Amino acid sequence: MNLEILDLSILGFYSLISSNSFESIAILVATIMPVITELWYNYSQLFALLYTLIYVGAVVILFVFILSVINEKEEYEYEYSGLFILILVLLLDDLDDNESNDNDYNNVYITDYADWFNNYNESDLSVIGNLLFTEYALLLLIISFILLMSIIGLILIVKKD
């Protein structure tokens, strides 16, 4: 019983009914959490933790910006919607969940055959660091160049003087 379906259905229901900005940043948290958990199992545990390390810090900075901008607008603005139409919209979106139309690729399972040739076994993060600092060191240096531009960019935009 894939419980990931139920969690996404609940998340999608609140996306259509979210009114204030606080409910929107809560939607973002309710989006990263299914991504991290579904990454923690199945595909990649490494990037599930990397998503938590980086995006959670961004969420707090996002949240503290909301406290400086909320201006009573959505605390009294009315919304109409309707319970019946919201469920109908979510039901129709539930009907089609096939992102690809290659039936053979989606219905036939495959296996891999492991080999003992790799006596030197290390984590994927070490291999990423091996290539990032040697093969693609230019990308790493340009990324630091972009980070430098952001630091200068933030100061000039925000600082009054």
Partner 1 sequence: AIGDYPVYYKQPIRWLSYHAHTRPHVFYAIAVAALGPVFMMATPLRRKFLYDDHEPLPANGYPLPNRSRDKTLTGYDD
Partner 2 sequence: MIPFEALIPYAIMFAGFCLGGGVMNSAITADITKRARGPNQEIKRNVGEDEGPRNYTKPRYNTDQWDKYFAVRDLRLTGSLRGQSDNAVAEESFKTNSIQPYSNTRRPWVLRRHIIMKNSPTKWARKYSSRRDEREQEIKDDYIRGMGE
Partner 3 sequence: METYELIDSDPKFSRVVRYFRPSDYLTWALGTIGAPGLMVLFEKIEPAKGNTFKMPPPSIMRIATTIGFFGGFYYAYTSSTKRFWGYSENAKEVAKDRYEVKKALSEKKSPYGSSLLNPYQQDMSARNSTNSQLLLAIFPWFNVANHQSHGIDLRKYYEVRDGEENWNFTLPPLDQVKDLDVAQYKEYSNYP
- Where does this chain bind partner 2 (CB under 8 A)? 2, 4-5, 8-9, 11-12, 15-16, 31, 34-35, 38-39, 42-43, 93, 96-102, 104-106, 109-111, 113-114, 116, 118-119, 121-122
140 forms part of the interface with ligand CDL (CB under 6 A): no
Give which of 12, 3, 10 is closest to 37, Cα–Cα: 3
Name the binder of 142 from ligand 3PE, partner 1, ligand CDL, none, CB < 5-8 A by kind. Answer: ligand CDL
Q: How far apart are CA 44 and CA 124, in angstroms?
A: 10
Count interface residues toward ligand 3PE (CB under 6 A).
13
Up-side HSE of residue 115: CA atoms within 13 Å toward CB?
2
Q: What is the distance of C-alpha 10 from the center of its chain?
A: 17
Cβ-based nearer residue to ligand 3PE, 27 or 50:
27
One residue of 30, 36, 62, 90 binding ligand 3PE per CB under 6 A: 30
Exposed e or buried b for every residue in 64-84, given b needs 16+ CB within 10 A?
eeeeeeeeeeeeeeeeeeeee
Q: How far apart are CA 35 and CA 32, in angstroms?
A: 5
43 forms part of the interface with ligand CDL (CB under 6 A): no
Under 8 Å between Cβ of 25 and 63? yes
Residues that bind ligand CDL (CB under 6 A): 141-142, 145
User: Applying CB under 6 A, which residues contact ligand 3PE?
Assistant: 7, 10-11, 14, 17, 19, 23, 26-27, 29-30, 33-34
